[PDB]
């Protein structure tokens, strides 16, 4: 809890480098990285999306070299989306934009999000429609009230499980996450063009106003991510969310702690 | 292990070349285009012809002989022939009655790398059941995991007219010795926006002030500049590419090997 000085020396720095895959709903054995073709409730009251139509937050707990009082301090992050060029595949049974047109490319509503934490990302539930019945097998806001639609402090949770927390009913809880650095962007709209930059030259610093990064409780580093890139439009017009993996490389150092 | 920068009368040198775009090159007359794009009968049977597939362009530049290695320090690059995209009269698709032709626009990948060795590629597939055509180097032993991430699919950008753009990306887990930059903008109506200037330098040094080091006295320029699609009168669409200029400042760095 009390943060003392940075230990330097021969064995004071270490590196995690992994990729997180996208859980987009994964209908069947052949469609990993897609959702199931989206359907719309008969009525506003009866909204109940199937689990394979709901993208979810991805999380990874990484065990770090054992210590001890010393804790691992996450100092810098590099991340990029892996496989951006795959979105140029405009020939795989898509929807011809017009007579003899190529297929309409992946585009539309996008959530690109990633966090680096010394513990689980902390989530606040917010519901578009509080009567939405989230499907068996997902962890969702419990005891939904109309207030759930704007804000309801009952809906707290930890991003502690994969294929679990739907994207559309959880956000980073801004009242918590002292020990995490989170960044995300929603671009909404059916025609929003994907814009994905890649570079191995961009480092992001994880230190706060006091020069302290996230501190890895239990010698664990917590990478969370979502990269819903848009929707794939099938020949029929039917639409599937399409996701992509995110690379992380985190510099860590040792910090003395009481 | 990287020692100090050698300075003096002949410590600096410059490479300056252009890379051409390989976009499919359908026939003798359509260099810089792809073949008019077709769409598979089914999701399962996706199998694009080789002349419908833009590919990464690469160029190995031999440097002066010199333990000393050449350090790539700065890059200037721009797309050559941006104005050519104003050609709205060459059997295009009238946007409307008495309209000019629809200009080149839509899905674009602008990418360029400067490396002391080949760009290192990771395979990622839109559809793992896509059959990449005979004559291209593609991800082998595709599994459904190939669609999101599959570490089997490693490769070197070591050959032209070879590596399709749509199934290879810079491998972010490698490329210590390369500086790569690219942007995908997707969408049928995405407007091209291409800036040109001889006044904009990009620095290639890392967090430790070391640029790429040219193994074997070789500098590796890679690039892709799929600008959009040309829409023919029929509505049929061909990718259109443009050449990329590079000018790389290099200096000599002492190294223990």
């Amino acid at each position: 809890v009390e943060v003392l000085e940075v230990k330097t020396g021969v064995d004071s720095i270490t590196e995690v480098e992994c990729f997180l895959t996208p859980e987009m709903g994964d209908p069947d054995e052949h469609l990993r990285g897609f959702s199931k073709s989206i359907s719309i409730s008969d009525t506003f009251e009866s909204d109940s999306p199937n689990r394979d139509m709901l993208p979810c937050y991805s999380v990874a707990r990484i065990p770090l070299p054992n210590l001890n009082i010393l804790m691992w301090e996450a100092v810098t992050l590099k991340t990029e989306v892996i496989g951006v060029t795959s979105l140029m595949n405009v020939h795989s049974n898509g929807q011809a934009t017009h007579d003899n047109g190529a297929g309409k490319p992946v585009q539309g509503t996008s959530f690109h999000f990633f966090s680096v934490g010394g513990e689980a990302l902390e989530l606040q539930g917010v519901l578009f429609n509080y009567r939405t019945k989230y499907p068996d097998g997902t962890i969702f806001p419990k005891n939904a009230t109309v207030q759930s639609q704007v804000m309801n402090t009952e809906h707290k949770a930890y991003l502690d499980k994969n294929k679990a927390y739907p994207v559309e009913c959880w956000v980073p809880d801004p009242t918590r996450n002292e020990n995490t650095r989170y960044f995300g962007t929603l671009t909404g709209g059916e025609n929003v063009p994907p814009v994905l930059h890649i570079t191995n030259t961009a480092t992001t610093v994880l230190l706060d106003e006091f020069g302290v990064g996230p501190l890895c409780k239990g010698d664990n580093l917590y990478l969370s991510a979502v990269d819903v890139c848009g929707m794939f439009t099938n020949r029929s017009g039917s639409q599937q969310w399409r996701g992509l993996s995110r690379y992380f490389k985190v510099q860590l150092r040792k910090r003395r702690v009481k | 292990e990287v020692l100090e920068v050698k300075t003096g009368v002949d410590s600096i040198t410059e490479v300056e070349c252009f890379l051409t775009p390989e976009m499919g090159d359908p026939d003798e007359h359509l260099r810089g285009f792809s073949k008019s794009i077709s769409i598979s009968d089914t999701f399962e049977s996706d199998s694009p012809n080789r002349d419908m597939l833009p590919c990464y362009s690469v160029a190995r530049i031999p440097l002066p002989n010199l333990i000393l290695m050449w350090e790539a320090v700065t890059l200037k690059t721009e797309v050559i022939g941006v104005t050519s995209l104003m050609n709205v009269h060459s059997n295009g698709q009238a946007t409307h009655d008495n309209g000019a032709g629809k200009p080149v626009q839509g899905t674009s990948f602008h990418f360029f790398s400067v490396g002391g060795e080949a760009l290192e590629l990771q395979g990622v597939l839109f559809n793992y059941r896509t059959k990449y055509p005979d004559g291209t180097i593609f991800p082998k032993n595709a599994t459904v995991q190939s669609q999101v991430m599959n570490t089997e699919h490693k490769a070197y950008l070591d050959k032209n007219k070879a590596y399709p753009v749509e199934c290879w990306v810079p491998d972010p887990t490698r490329n210590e010795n390369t500086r790569y930059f690219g942007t995908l903008t997707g969408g049928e109506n995405v407007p091209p926006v291409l800036h040109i200037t001889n006044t904009a330098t990009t620095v290639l040094l890392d967090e430790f002030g070391v640029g790429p080091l040219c193994k074997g006295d070789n500098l590796y320029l890679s690039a892709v500049d799929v600008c959009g699609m040309f829409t023919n009168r029929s509505g049929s669409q061909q990718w259109r590419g443009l050449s990329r200029y590079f000018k790389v400042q290099l200096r000599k760095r002492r190294v223990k090997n």
Partner: nanobody
Amino acid sequence: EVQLVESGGGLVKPGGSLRLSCAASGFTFSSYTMNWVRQAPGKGLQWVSSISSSSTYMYYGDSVKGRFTISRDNARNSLYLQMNSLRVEDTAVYYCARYAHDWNVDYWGQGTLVTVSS
């Protein structure tokens, strides 16, 4: 373009057995989930069984659970249905059909008649 051809259908006595064959030409058979659907004389259609491209996922209608077995040989471009413990109700023309993504069930064969009578 795409043709499916069924065979093996005929007369067998209740409690009997029978193996049906679908011969696929015109497409990479080995790439598609394949289905058996049957049609009892004068009644509508009724799905029997499905099998994935790699035979990882077989599904059966309730009416034949435990009696019928679907199988494929991707090297021989052929889908099979093993029909054991046949009943009078199992009398129908048995059709072989392809499922493609987004298309759903698209191409059918000519069907082969299975008559179960003493």
